[PDB]
């Protein structure tokens, strides 16, 4: 639709919502793979992804087309199943914030 009105929802609803979330805070932030002790996380994860990029895109018009942040968001959350085993609770957590994504999306404007 109207590029604007999106992105806007996305920053203004959908980014708002899972930013406040109790499982928000492991995303709020790029992955630190020394202070954490991951040694091959960078080896792994080759497109890096957080809320803060995505936040910090959404408020510089980085982005041109609503798909593209939510590209950001998926990667986001496909870095995490991917470096992680099935039974972490990041794994958990990040599949909790996915879900409200993808209802929340579900209402994005079209004009
Ligand atoms: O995919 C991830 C990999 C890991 N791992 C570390 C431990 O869990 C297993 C593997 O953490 C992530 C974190 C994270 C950030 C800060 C933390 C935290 C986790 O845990 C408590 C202490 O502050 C955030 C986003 C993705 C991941
Ligand atoms: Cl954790
Ligand atoms: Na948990």
Request: net charge positive; proline share 5%.
């Amino acid at each position: 639709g109207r590029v604007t009105n999106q992105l806007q929802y996305l920053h203004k609803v959908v980014m708002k919502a899972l930013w406040k979330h109790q499982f928000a805070w492991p995303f709020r932030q790029p992955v630190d793979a020394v202070k954490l002790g991951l040694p091959d996380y960078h080896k792994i994860i080759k497109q890096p992804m957080d809320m803060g990029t995505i936040k910090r895109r959404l408020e510089n018009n980085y982005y041109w087309a609503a798909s593209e942040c939510m590209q950001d968001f998926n990667t986001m959350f496909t870095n995490c199943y991917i470096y992680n085993k099935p039974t972490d609770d990041i794994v958990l957590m990040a599949q909790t914030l996915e879900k409200i994504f993808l209802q929340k999306v579900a209402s994005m404007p079209q004009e």
